[PDB]
């Protein structure tokens, strides 16, 4: 056999370069079942004559893959082949790389288009090899390759159609693209993000500095006035917050339903649903940037509509194509008099719009004075407590949607009540913000990894989570995000008008199924309860305290007088609750009434949606929706852990295509290894909650958290979303996947 | 027999107290054949027991009809029923009315609405001693039935389940609202509106003098620019122009096609195609401002797209969910370059458009000089001409559309050559004017009734056709609309700023097929060439003399210096034929010259079918579609000389329940009487195209005109589409009704 090189020649194939190829890069992997004998044994049959050696990577790259069959020790070994071939088109160094970008004329006409900033290129005409003899470029291969499989796919942007970036400059533009002229607090940015301590979210690696930087998370559009002139300012923005991304989460609770009398030439406005498909003809047409990610939106309705039944059964496949709008994600944000209507049992009005001005407003003791009077009147029509339930669950059996939620603790609990009250969430279920005509508040987010934080003890023997690491790097972001909602050129004036007021902020957490399985204590019993609170009660402590010294200098947050935080006051406190108490809140909740913060709303933790993918940890706080993912992926924290009490070989390989990540009924497992590694399908939701009220009350803004079954029964659903509101949850639900 | 009083009093149906109420009402309509005798028994046999004489008369004045089955006498027959009867829950008073419409207390939340503007309502207090003084009520019962039955429809106010205005009071309050203050010209339109002579627009028959006067039917919303900047404009701009009514002709020459480059997002936008749907929810939803009459605009292209395929034939039912649109009418743009080219044969580029556009702005010799610069080197692709003209004589034999309206055509013969090249026709293809960024330019439709002017001339034996007085007639509406152009209430900035500009107006014909078949004459030969040209040398020439001298009085328009008028020139010296001579053109362009036009364009002739059937005369310039309809109605001239050469039976009248109108075929049917009475699918299409020029002449902008043939054939499309265009009609085809 002959092999063609990077050039055009002929290679006398050999079998001691090949796996000197892999031999010195099976490395630092225990090899108790693991050998290079086993691998070119297998690939050298299927080798074209008509394939070149990146395209004889291309199999290897799948090859090295089909054996994590038996242990974890080939998943870098098929990551070692893939990062390695982009090492090859275009070579190693950060500046090249960013060089020939910046001077960019097109094949079509002309016209020399800046790829690239002048912003993350200026800093770097006088600072270039303190950006090249401190960058290690072995750290493009301690990514997970399905994060490169991200990386490849399109993150690392293309010329020519080629991925020219390897990871190691998908980690340092995003160093002075926020830092800059502080050079100084930018690496150490880059530090710990090709370390996996904490990656950045969806949006914060896709343009973090080119020419014109929109580098916010997740919208919380405004609707401003029911009627033909106030929706075509927001027809247009949602659209223009679609061509340059971001998800968006609209708020309706005012505009006129299929009943109210028409403002002009008389009729009536056909209601709610000739809405969610013009909308939806913008939700299905501007492909966020041309051809990038679509544009997905959450809406935000509740059961005092007299068509809440035209917007609940939505996301349903059948009844008809028109009043079936497909692709408008629908939220709830429940009266929860509504619900205090369901459990004793009732009935509830469903007002038609122009029937209740202010309406779209009152909240918690406010309502119960504002609902009171709307029915001994009867300002539209009274259905029962139980049936629009039945309707809100339904749109949940079939599809899923929508997402249970509570208008009087978004802003009880919630750190906004002072510039008016918070009518919309996000695309995501967790940004608690006011939104207004004039006023917009966007979010920044990112995702720091918990099995980053985790070390050996000083006796072998045991070893407690490392609660300094997880605040002294949750510093650096704090430092991150006040040059996020700062360098952000906005497309239009409302994105801009409402983020340089408050400058809210969303940050949360990667790997909670790497920790716990890592740690050495199950995923459920004591040892569980005893390290969520103090993951989180740091983080309200890790970046509320680097926060706080942000208000010596710059100046404050604008809106100050009134907020929570100046009047012995911060959100647990809200919670009608106390502290843990290791962390500094006698001196905290101190550190902030003279001074001041520069943030408003903080704590709001997110399940990344193009994130954990990368780091290769299992996403935000949840376990495993499934051992075997998609093709095939293995439970690795269930194959380092099943291969030495004498449960390897062969068999249990057909244990779980079918049994659907079933671990629950396995023979050669006595108890340590079936409740650690507890499916989602077969762990309990009602315990996922007792410690979600030991993991909400540190948060100021709000969070996402899905709702599992195996065998769906309604009743399961009156004691499932009945276990999140008499506690007082953040949301009730968030999705469902059923069965 | 019982039938108890419209107000409580016990009645009886009799046979000459029933049919007396109609025996005195037996006035100005033949007796030979009608007698009051043979049916009011079998409507008294048809009376059953349980309803008032407020709805005694549903089906006793709906049956009066039914007897048009003998004479055109039963029919405004029928109506004297109805008028003494609407004549009953209605307090006439002009003073009565117009003080309970005023203040008029809505018992549905508390606001009342007004229906006047704080202008016209106050026209009527002073007034009222001279304005109930002149409103003659014998002419309320000289109305067709068919003529009410579109009023009583929707036309007319109706308040708490009750009608407003009866048809004089409306008749007049479009006279205190247009003239506003003119009382001695408001008389003036009443008499001639309540005497036959004319019609006005659209809008001031829904909106004369009202809350916000929109009196404009045609509009010609223009795309701005190529992105979410200029595109969620002309969907804002297509909506408060239609929020208060008023359908478009919408151009669209310069939006990138399927495959170009963007913007600025660096990708493709899918073209044409998921474009013109973001707009269908909205043209669908919003029926004129809710509930009244929704969208289905014109949209006006030219070839040149690189998505005139994925367009032409968007009327077809049976293809697919997506790519057609059923509701919005699709119309082109054709150049002077297209037309010359399908001949001879050879190729056409179908460009994109940021590759070459400009061509959407030019014409004639602008074209054969610039086009053959973007082709010559190749800037698209050049695919076949016997196709795509294939795929328009698809949708023509499909669907029915495109409407066929060239440009370079549109552009080089009218006189307005000072604002820029014409884009686009509007919904109607009957207003050819400039439209561009916010230069929004408008018209308020209108239609002047041609018979009601046969005299009894000067011995009852041999009558007389008159242009005498019609000239004057065409002369006081010239007033009525500049009374209109004013008074009127816009929704934006662009609908405006080209109407007190320009001043153009739009001006018809309609009751054309009354009069042929009326004066011993046809529809076709000399005796029917040479008149439909001194009836528009009365008309153009005095609407154009109606103008002449309010460039005396109230001043020329703004850009008129230039323009043809200026220069020794108009119309059917710019198409450079020989004057025709009863008329003052010598004078008249002698006093143009020095003293000016208030208005640009006056002819507009419109299908009419906005204005015809109130009246009773037929849907413009066409003949008649069926000499039988619907509710089934047989030609009337036809039905009344029956009875002369006696033909009149059944036996040759089931032959009309029957031939689908249609009269070549009976043994014995005399030669100007065969003649007389033709159908529309029944005569050749080679002179409508000779005619159409002897009526473009005297005719500045464009004429809605349908073509109706049975065979659909290409073979024979051929050389009847050609014609139209060789001597130069200017819309050379509207609708292709096959059928």
């Given at each position: 056999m002959y092999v063609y090189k990077r050039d055009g020649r002929k290679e006398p194939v050999q079998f001691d370069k090949i796996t000197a190829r892999i031999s010195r890069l099976?490395?630092?992997?225990?090899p108790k079942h693991i050998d290079?004998?086993?691998?070119?044994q297998r690939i050298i049959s299927g080798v074209?004559?008509?394939?070149?050696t990146i395209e004889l990577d291309n199999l290897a790259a799948e090859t090295?893959?089909?054996?994590?069959?038996?242990?974890?020790?080939?998943?870098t070994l098929a990551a070692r082949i893939a990062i390695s071939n982009l090492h090859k088109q275009t070579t190693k160094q950060f500046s090249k790389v960013v060089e020939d970008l910046y001077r960019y004329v097109n094949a079509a006409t002309g016209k020399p288009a800046p790829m690239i900033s002048d912003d993350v290129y200026n800093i770097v005409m006088e600072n270039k090899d303190k950006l090249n003899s401190a960058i290690?470029?072995?750290?493009?291969?301690?990514?997970?390759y399905f994060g490169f499989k991200t990386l490849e796919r399109s993150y690392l942007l293309r010329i020519?159609?080629?991925?020219?970036?390897r990871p190691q400059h998908l980690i340092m533009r995003v160093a002075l693209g926020i830092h800059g002229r502080d050079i100084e607090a930018a690496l150490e940015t880059y530090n710990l993000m090709s370390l996996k301590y904490f990656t950045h979210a969806s949006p914060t690696?896709?343009?973090?500095?080119?020419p014109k930087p929109q580098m916010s998370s997740c919208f919380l559009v405004a609707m401003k006035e029911d009627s033909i002139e106030g929706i075509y300012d927001t027809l247009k923005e949602c659209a223009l917050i679609s061509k340059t991304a971001g998800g968006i989460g609209l708020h309706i609770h005012n505009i006129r339903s299929t009943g109210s009398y028409i403002?002009?030439?008389?009729?009536?406005?056909?209601?709610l649903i000739p809405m969610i498909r013009v909308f939806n003809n913008t939700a299905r047409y501007v492909?966020?940037?041309?051809?990038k990610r679509p544009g997905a939106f959450a809406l935000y309705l509740e059961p005092?509509?007299?068509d809440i039944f035209d917007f609940?059964?939505?996301?349903?496949?059948?009844?008809?194509?028109?009043?079936?709008?497909?692709?408008?994600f629908p939220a709830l944000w429940i009266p929860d008099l509504f619900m205090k209507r369901v459990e004793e049992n009732g009935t509830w009005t469903l007002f038609?719009?122009?029937?209740?001005?202010g309406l779209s407003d009152c909240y918690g003791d406010e309502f119960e004075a504002l609902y009171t009077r709307y029915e001994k009147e009867g300002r539209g029509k009274t259905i029962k407590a139980q049936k629009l339930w039945y309707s809100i669950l339904e749109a949940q059996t079939?599809?899923?949607?929508?997402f249970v939620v509570y208008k009087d603790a978004c802003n009880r609990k919630?750190?906004?009540?002072?510039?008016?009250?918070?009518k919309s969430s996000n695309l995501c279920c967790e940004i608690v913000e006011y939104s207004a005509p004039d006023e917009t508040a966007v979010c920044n987010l990112a995702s720091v990894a918990l099995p980053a934080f985790i070390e050996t003890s000083e006796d072998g023997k045991t070893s407690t989570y490392n609660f300094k690491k997880l605040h002294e790097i949750a510093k650096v972001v704090t430092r991150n995000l006040n040059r996020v909602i700062d360098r952000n050129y906005y497309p239009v004036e409302e994105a801009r008008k409402s983020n340089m007021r408050h400058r809210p902020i969303a940050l949360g957490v990667q790997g909670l199924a790497d920790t716990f399985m890592l740690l050495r204590?199950?995923?459920?019993?004591e040892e569980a309860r005893l390290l969520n609170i103090q993951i989180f009660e740091t983080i309200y402590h890790a970046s509320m305290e680097a926060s706080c010294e942000l208000?010596?200098?710059?100046?404050?947050?604008?809106?100050?007088?009134?907020?929570?935080?100046?009047?012995?006051?911060?959100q647990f406190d809200m919670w009608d609750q106390k502290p843990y108490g290791m962390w500094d809140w006698d001196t905290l909740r101190k550190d902030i009434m003279k001074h001041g913060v520069r943030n408003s709303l903080t704590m709001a933790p997110m399940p990344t949606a193009s994130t954990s993918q990368i780091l290769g940890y299992n996403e935000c706080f949840e376990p495993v929706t499934?051992?075997?993912?998609?093709?095939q992926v293995v439970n690795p924290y269930l194959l380092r852990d099943l291969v030495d009490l004498g449960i390897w070989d062969?068999?249990?390989?057909?244990?779980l295509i079918t049994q659907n990540?079933?671990?629950?009924?396995?023979?050669?497992?006595?108890?340590?290894?079936?409740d650690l590694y507890k499916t989602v399908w077969e762990?309990?939701?009602?315990?996922?909650?007792n410690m979600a009220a030991d993991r909400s009350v540190y948060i100021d803004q709000s969070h996402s958290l899905n709702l599992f079954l195996r065998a769906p029964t309604m009743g399961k659903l009156t004691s499932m979303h009945f276990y999140?509101?008499?506690?007082?949850?953040?949301?009730?639900?968030?999705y469902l996947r059923t069965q």
């Open positions: 099976c490395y630092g992997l225990d290079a004998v086993k691998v070119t074209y004559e008509g394939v070149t090295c893959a089909y054996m994590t069959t038996v242990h974890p020790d080939y998943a290690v470029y072995d750290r493009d291969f301690q990514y997970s020519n159609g080629q991925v020219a970036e690696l896709f343009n973090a500095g080119t403002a002009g030439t008389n009729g009536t406005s056909n209601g492909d966020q940037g041309g051809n005092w509509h007299a609940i059964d939505i996301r349903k496949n059948h009844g008809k194509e028109e009043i079936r709008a497909r692709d408008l038609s719009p122009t029937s209740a001005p079939e599809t899923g949607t929508p919630s750190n906004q009540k002072n510039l008016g009250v918070i204590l199950p995923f459920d019993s208000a010596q200098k710059d100046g404050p947050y604008e809106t100050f007088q009134g907020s929570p935080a100046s009047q012995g006051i911060l499934s051992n075997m993912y998609s093709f062969e068999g249990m390989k057909q244990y990540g079933s671990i629950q009924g396995l023979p050669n497992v006595p108890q340590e290894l079936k762990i309990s939701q009602k315990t996922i909650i999140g509101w008499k506690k007082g949850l953040k949301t009730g639900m968030y």
